[PDB]
Write a protein that binds this ligand. Structure first.
Ligand SMILES: NC(=O)c1cccc([C@@H]2O[C@H](COP(=O)(O)OP(=O)(O)OC[C@H]3O[C@@H](n4cnc5c(N)ncnc54)[C@H](O)[C@@H]3O)[C@@H](O)[C@H]2O)c1
Length: 238
């Protein structure tokens, strides 16, 4: 195999022959350099946005992969000029990552239950790494998870304070944001390319009337997501 060993390690983890399985992902996977500015930014985002409710474990970044799915840049082109683009977390089971990288993040099928959703059938993201990391479903006997960083074109956000059955957005709105009691410090936001990265440490949002601990972000069109990084995370349980 021509591929770097961290990429090979990643392919074995995703599938349960290396170069043929890499081809099935339809994704270009580079290893982000550990000393680069990108890696420093990504590690800061992981360190700063680990919440106090989720103190069962600490997170260690093992490998950072830059990912470019085939045709996704072209699919995302209409939304790339849209304002309020953000780099946000999406966690999932390791078993879903073959489908995720080959097909992109999808909205759960019509057959999935509408009742288990805070804000309807969309694609959910967090600005707190520990919120999304819980959706890895890692365990003491299987303590390595995968987590995405997506560029999400949020546009005008419909900002809600409680769970709502959203089937359609108000005119001019492109996404929903559930407002949490705690938020990454908005004065600590940085810009990586044209994308906002909410990597400040947690503070009180000053939104008193809300039932969510942390923010979440939902989009209802799959083309509003451009996947950027895949992190292999070690969960150190307390
Ligand atoms: N996941 C998060 O990081 C996250 C962030 C903020 C907030 C939330 C919170 O989760 C709640 C929703 O969870 P639930 O799994 O019930 O719903 P839902 O998100 O629709 O489940 C579908 C699963 O299918 C995965 N997948 C997507 N594309 C593909 C694909 N091509 N191939 C295969 N699998 C794919 C996806 O990752 C997910 O695990 C929601 O109500 C909200 O409270 C999560």
């Amino acid at each position: 195999s021509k591929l770097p060993k961290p990429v090979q390690d990643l392919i074995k983890m995703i599938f349960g022959p290396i170069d043929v399985n890499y081809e099935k992902l339809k994704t270009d996977i580079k290893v982000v350099d550990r000393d680069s500015e990108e890696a420093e930014i990504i590690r800061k985002y992981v360190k700063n946005t680990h919440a106090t409710t989720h103190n069962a474990y600490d997170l260690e970044v093992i490998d950072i992969f830059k990912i470019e799915r085939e045709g996704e840049c072209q699919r995302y082109k209409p939304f790339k000029q849209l304002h309020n683009r953000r780099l946000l977390w999406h966690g999932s089971r390791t078993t879903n990552f073959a489908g995720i990288l080959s097909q992109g993040l999808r909205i759960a099928p019509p057959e999935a239950p509408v009742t288990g959703y805070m804000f309807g059938k969309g694609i959910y993201f967090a600005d707190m790494v520990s919120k999304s990391a819980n959706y890895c479903h890692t365990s003491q006997g299987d303590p390595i998870g995968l987590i995405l960083l997506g560029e999400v074109a949020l546009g005008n956000m419909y900002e809600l304070k409680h769970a709502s059955h959203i089937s359609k957005l108000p005119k001019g709105k492109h996404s929903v944001k559930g407002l949490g009691k705690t938020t990454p410090d908005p004065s600590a936001n940085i810009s990586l390319d044209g994308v906002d990265v909410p990597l400040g440490t947690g503070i009180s949002s000053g939104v008193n009337d809300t039932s969510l601990l942390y923010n979440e972000y939902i989009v209802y069109d799959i083309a509003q997501v451009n996947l950027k990084y895949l992190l292999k995370l070690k969960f150190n349980f307390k």
